[PDB]
Amino acid sequence: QIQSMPKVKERVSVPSKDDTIYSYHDSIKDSIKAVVNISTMERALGSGVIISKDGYIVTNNHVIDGADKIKVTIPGSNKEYSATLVGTDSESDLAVIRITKDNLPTIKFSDSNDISVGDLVFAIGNPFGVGESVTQGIVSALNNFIQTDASINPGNSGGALIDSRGGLVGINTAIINHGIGFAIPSNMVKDTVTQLIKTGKIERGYLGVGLQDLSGDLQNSWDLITEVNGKKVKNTNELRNLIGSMLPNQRVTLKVIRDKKERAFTLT
C-alpha cells in the first residue's frame, strides 16, 4: 500500500532564451558593498559587515582575537582604514570595531525568527580586500545557530549571511567537513552589537544558584554564595538571568526555603 506521486508531465527550467541568463546578482548587488575585509593583502584575517552609517562593523570574535592593529578595506576605493575595537563577546563569537568614515554602505537586519528551512541564502565575504566572494545555499536547520549548505569557510567567516532580499539573516562563522556551515542568527547579532557599543561588553546577570531538572523526584508536578536547587527546564532560567542584565528586579516561585527550591519561569 505504497502511496505514489503522479506522473511527471511538464518540466520547468530557467529562461530557455538564447538572449538571457539566470542570476542572483541583482538580489545581492547591494549587500556586497557592506561586507569589508579585515587585516592587520598577503596575510588577511576574516571578513566583516558594516552595520552603521557612521562606521560600526561586525565580525567574529575569533577573527580578530590576537591582533594589535586592525585595518579594513571597503568594496571600491581600495583605501585601508584604521579600525578600533569596541567590544568582544567570547561566548557569542561576536566583536564590534569602528572606522572613521561616514555615509558607508550599511546592511539591513532581517528577523532571524521568521526564516524557515529551505530559504534561499547567500554567504558574502571579503577574504582578501580585492573583491567579493559569494556562495549560494539554503537554510538547512534551525534552532541559536543557523545551518546552511552554503560554503562557510575562513574566507566567509565574519561575513554576511543574507536572504534573497539582501537582508542580513546571520553572520558567518567558520569552525574547524560535511559541507554544512554555521551562522550566528541576526537577532542575536543585533542584541549583542548594541550592548557591545553601549556598555563596551556583554553584561549577563547572576543569581547564585545551581540548577537541575526533575525526572523521577517530581513533587507536585540567597545570592552572595551558594545553592543547589531545581527548576522546570533548568536551561531557560539561565537564559532568563543572563538576559536580566545586571541589577534589575527579581521574581521567583515557591518550594520551601532557600536551598532545595524550585523556580517556575513565567513573568517579571
Partner: peptide, 4 residues
C-alpha cells in the same frame, strides 16, 4: 560573570 556576576550581577544581582
Amino acid at each position: 560573570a556576576a550581577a544581582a
